[PDB]
Design a protein around this ligand. Sequence first.
Ligand SMILES: OC[C@H]1O[C@@H](O)[C@H](O)[C@@H](O)[C@H]1O
Ligand SMILES: OC[C@H]1O[C@@H](O)[C@H](O)[C@@H](O)[C@H]1O
Ligand SMILES: [Mg+2]
Ligand SMILES: [Mg+2]
Ligand SMILES: [Mn+2]
Ligand SMILES: [Mn+2]
Ligand code: NA
Ligand code: NA
Ligand code: NA
Ligand code: NA
Ligand code: NA
Ligand code: NA
Ligand code: NA
Ligand code: NA
Lengths: 250, 129, 129, 1024
Amino acid sequence: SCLIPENLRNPKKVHENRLPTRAYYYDQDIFESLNGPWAFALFDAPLDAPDAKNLDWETAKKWSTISVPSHWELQEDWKYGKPIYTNVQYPIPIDIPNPPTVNPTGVYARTFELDSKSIESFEHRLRFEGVDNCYELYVNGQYVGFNKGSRNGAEFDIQKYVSEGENLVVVKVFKWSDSTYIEDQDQWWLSGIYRDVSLLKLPKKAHIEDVRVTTTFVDSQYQDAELSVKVDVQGSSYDHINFTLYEPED
Amino acid sequence: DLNALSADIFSFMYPTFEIMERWRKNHTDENGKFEKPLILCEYGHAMGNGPGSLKEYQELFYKEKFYQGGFIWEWANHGIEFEDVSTADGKLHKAYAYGGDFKEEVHDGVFIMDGLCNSEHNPTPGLVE
Amino acid sequence: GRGPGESYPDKKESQRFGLYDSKDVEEFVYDYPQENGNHTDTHFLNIKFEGAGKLSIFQKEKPFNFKISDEYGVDEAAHACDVKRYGRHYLRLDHAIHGVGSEACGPAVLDQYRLKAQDFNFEFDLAFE
Amino acid sequence: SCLIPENLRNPKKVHENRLPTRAYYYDQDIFESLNGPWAFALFDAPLDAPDAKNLDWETAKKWSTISVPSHWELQEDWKYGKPIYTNVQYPIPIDIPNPPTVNPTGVYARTFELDSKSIESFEHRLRFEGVDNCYELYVNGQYVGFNKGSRNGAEFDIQKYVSEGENLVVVKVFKWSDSTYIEDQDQWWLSGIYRDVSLLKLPKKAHIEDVRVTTTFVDSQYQDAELSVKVDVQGSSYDHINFTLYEPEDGSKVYDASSLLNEENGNTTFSTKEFISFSTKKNEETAFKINVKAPEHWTAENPTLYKYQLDLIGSDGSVIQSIKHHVGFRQVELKDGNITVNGKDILFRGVNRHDHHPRFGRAVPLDFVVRDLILMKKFNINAVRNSHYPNHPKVYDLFDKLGFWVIDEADLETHGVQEPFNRHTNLEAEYPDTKNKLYDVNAHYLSDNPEYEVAYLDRASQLVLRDVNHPSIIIWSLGNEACYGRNHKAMYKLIKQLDPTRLVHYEGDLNALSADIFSFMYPTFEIMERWRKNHTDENGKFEKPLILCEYGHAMGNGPGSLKEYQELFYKEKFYQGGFIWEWANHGIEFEDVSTADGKLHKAYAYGGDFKEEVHDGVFIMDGLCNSEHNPTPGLVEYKKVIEPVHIKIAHGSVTITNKHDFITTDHLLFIDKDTGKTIDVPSLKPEESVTIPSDTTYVVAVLKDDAGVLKAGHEIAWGQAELPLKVPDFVTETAEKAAKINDGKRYVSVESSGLHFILDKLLGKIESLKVKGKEISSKFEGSSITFWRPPTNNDEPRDFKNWKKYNIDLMKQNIHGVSVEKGSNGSLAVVTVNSRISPVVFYYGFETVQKYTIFANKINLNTSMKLTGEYQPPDFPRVGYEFWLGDSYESFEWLGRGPGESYPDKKESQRFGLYDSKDVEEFVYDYPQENGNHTDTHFLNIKFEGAGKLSIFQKEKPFNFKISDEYGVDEAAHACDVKRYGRHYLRLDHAIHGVGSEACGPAVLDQYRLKAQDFNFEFDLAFE
Ligand SMILES: OC[C@H]1O[C@@H](O)[C@H](O)[C@@H](O)[C@H]1O
Ligand SMILES: OC[C@H]1O[C@@H](O)[C@H](O)[C@@H](O)[C@H]1O
Ligand SMILES: [Mg+2]
Ligand SMILES: [Mg+2]
Ligand SMILES: [Mn+2]
Ligand SMILES: [Mn+2]
Ligand code: NA
Ligand code: NA
Ligand code: NA
Ligand code: NA
Ligand code: NA
Ligand code: NA
Ligand code: NA
Ligand code: NA
């Protein structure tokens, strides 16, 4: 079935190059928002979509814009189709793990600016809070990776692909995939980058990757407790960690 | 996972009292001990005028230690705002869409409109009850 | 009777007893038009006429049910805007009414709330001020 | 007067310890938000309020909370009172400068945490973006200061009072003060901390306090420009400053709510595309001037901005502080008697905008302001007037980026001083050329009062200094309706001193003795024209131009005659356009008991609804948009008349004229709507035109690509060829069919195959007309031809008075004779009705002849009406028939103007086409009034379920119609009060009175008035 791309019909291809999942923490100093208007075009199926390895900003620049985050079935004048409601029944034929060959494909593009010092100071990532159904990601005409799981997040290391000045982000989003079979909630079928997109700037030489906090009572009488804090630090250039717990607020 | 072979909790959706009660008795031993409790992950389907008999479910919750309550399906109608031609008027009006309104090949109609709150996320008599 | 909102045999206990005025109440609009606006366990009903006092209505020995509206075509109405309205109001004065249940997905109206087929006997007074 | 505190009754006590005003810049790293829940208590008057020098957090902690920012008259269950609406009249007694002794006092309290290091690292301030009316401020039980000026901001140094750990902020807010007298805008009276509160943390040893950016063209040819940057640094511990200017982003930039509101900086790399750099040297002036090579002009039509970064740099070479903002290269001049931007004499396509939200009042979320502005751009607006005070400081960037010509106005209205005078002297009308003499007599109380000079100057100083770096602001305004006096001259001197780069406006200064512009509100054309001629010399030169700071009062159904104003704007160089009053109705959401229902409904409140002692009723409901800030037919009409491209189709030609000020037509796609194929239109500059030969009837000018906040395909302008009235080719059945005719005692009956016609001879009433399964009958109360409409807001002051006086609503038809004869030229029967149509109690009326010619499938109705009798009314609201439609009635369709309502002096935005009732959302007025008329109707089709259609048309002339089920509109105060019948009716009218703007402004113009005269018209009722 070569008229439908391999990654859309492979249940094991859950992601390509996605960073391991970590506990979520929003930090104003690290999270830069990439929400706003993006260049966007819709295509009948993947084969009509441009090869992102050759897509310039000069070319994409000329497309209509859509605002991120939003669903593409919920636009002014229903420009890109309408919502579909199914409870149980799949809105596609069942031929596991194949999606239909006719498979609405949305391509998103925008740019962001990077400093001379920024690339020296920070490890750069892209974080997508939710994209339905799945997508491939390109930076500066280069393939970064792939992802499935519509209501899960995803982070990707961008450091290798990044340049001083203008940077190009292109996201190819597909409506159906092998994943559709396991996403059949009794709800509206809706597509697109429907959650936040962020550029993360983490300190380069060393930074906090993951944290784990548990509270366990030592006792049958639920009084004294053990507070356990486990931190996974990434990189060598650090000395130690401090922890300060504050008086409670009722 | 009905028998919780790989879960820590028993869970039913929309059961009758008879069905809740049989389950309890089959999982309470001679001592009065049970190994796992029952929750209703979904009950009292809140579609339209209703749900009825939330009272009788609650009586059951308070009465037995085996029952630890439940979660109503659902918080709010999934209506989407759109423009509908009125059957009464011949004119265009703001309305809330469910299956069929966006002219789907296949759809499940009003089944998306099953909340304690309406499409605009405001309380219905269901939530008041 | 029960208020300020609607009440039904198996969905009424949140509506406490009191004296209620139609003017103080925002009538609830369902997203999908259906049976609404009944008041159960009504002790007495006063209907006010401009410059002519009131008409008091009560049922002997047992509280009653009522609805006052100008609406029709609710069955066929797909959305709120599809609901037709008469040029005058009507009183729906009921001895009894079927419960509401959760049968769209779940148990039927429980036995003690079903309006079962049987003989009916009831007396009303229409008392004019 | 010791029972009222000194500071509340002292006009000179404008503030205590307030820091000097500086240019506003939001910085995420410096601004910490103190918004959220605060402890709050309300007190009857100041003397009941606690001494803040002794108030603990432990004590305040126990109070109820209110959320900041919000008004205290807009709380859950109206906990702390209700809003009060006054237009002119003060809601207090006048005893300048004393407020009432009973003076609602709200005390606010919250805490914030301070670090050990924070006090070492930073100078700490408190900034309040707006508090109504005035307040004293305490930190840690210590008095910090005092402030007045409700829509101005204020900063206070907090460093001395601050402690490590828990800090206590207490704010005592008073509703009335000496300041109230100068804050009497036509709006809701609302109180409290209604805008943001922030804790500022500035770097301690040295920091950027103020910045000043000007762009001046070196040249008569508006090419090279001098960019001047002056920075005021506070403290010694810095080396120099750096400035980086970046390559421009064209004004056609795409924006949305999300990107406009994005506030992120710090680690975000501002821009990379460097255009120019500059550095100061150690120990030298922290200011500079640089020559810029032919920069991209900023304009409202193309708001091109150059981003910049300003860095304060320490001895070690590190960045102490940054400011990231933008430069707009533009210059405003009074040149050859015109307001000129970049050499060009511009046109204001403007609107007055208050801060208003239907639930939050003047505490408008930015999200909602963006909503307003996007909508304005979508309806061809290019200018905004900040009536009548500055907005939230963050709004001005939106103007810069979206492109609006902005009049930023001082928070100063004195109107209330006039009211007793108006009443004492029984004053009926004010006129723009003459009215300033009425304000002159009361000026001494405030605007000519030397005790108020400091306050007036402060409103001016605060206005300018906060907003001085926004290229979109081209005019400073001294306030609104504050008479004229020495204080205004003082304001003018100060502003020119502080900001030489802009022009000064003040409408109350008729002769612009201390203003740079002439300004009228609601003038007639005669009045505009006289002024022009008296200020144009023999050479054709004028010294200053005229704008209309307010015109075309948009209250309710209206405004009428925007067309005739616009013709004047384009015709004379002396007129530079104007601003509609107002952007949106000020309705507040509330729960109203329905007059139709006896039940509770959501409605929008105006004066009287919150049961005020004194109020000004519906006068708050005067917007182009409704209370929910959505377009009314007023806005739809405005977009058309101000369209920046003219498209005229006549004589096999399309003439297209570019009516922009700066941009070409190149971004527009011109479509021939008859074929759907584009017309190749050359690039047209401002004022250039082209004639293209074409067979077309209908041409549209639309956006090629997404630009600004507009989408590809958005309609900017359009034109149509005039459509002749074509008689539809309906075929009348003239075949000889026998007909049963019964001329009874009272009722006349005509029965044939597929036909049943019954007329009541006593009344002139069609009891029933049933042709081929379709039924109509007369909607009859008194007369078969009626004249009444539910009065518009514009009808209320005069026309309604007249119509009511002449009993037009009580017109009666008195039948004299009915003639019945057999058909002749193919007709079945002729029924002729002779009557007088005349109201009770009056002589005047119409000798009327109604001739019904009945065919098998058609009814011809010829109406002759001859006006007779002494003491006649000047005009009528309308004249026509009312029919009940049968139960089968389902929808309608018409050839004419649409999709929405149209009236004689408000119709040109509704283009000709075939329209279906089903495709149209009928507009609901906030205040129920005349609506839903369709003028210039060629024909009307009424569809009946399973019985085809009834086609209606008028001979030789287009007609008017409305189809509804509504009644009781006259008495209905709110939408929910409107009554509805169990069936629909057709209002079929020969003619209809215009709409005008007389609630405030000119009467319906003569050619739009339905003048009293004879009427003669023929209708066909053709049944399928
Ligand atoms: O309202 C019907 C509901 O039925 C439940 O069984 C299901 O878990 C829900 O997702 C929803 O489909
Ligand atoms: O709607 C009446 C309006 O009248 C104008 O004279 C005034 O400037 C406006 O602020 C408003 O009062
Ligand atoms: Mg399901
Ligand atoms: Mg005023
Ligand atoms: Mn509908
Ligand atoms: Mn009302
Ligand atoms: Na589904
Ligand atoms: Na339990
Ligand atoms: Na459902
Ligand atoms: Na229905
Ligand atoms: Na006022
Ligand atoms: Na002009
Ligand atoms: Na007003
Ligand atoms: Na009215």
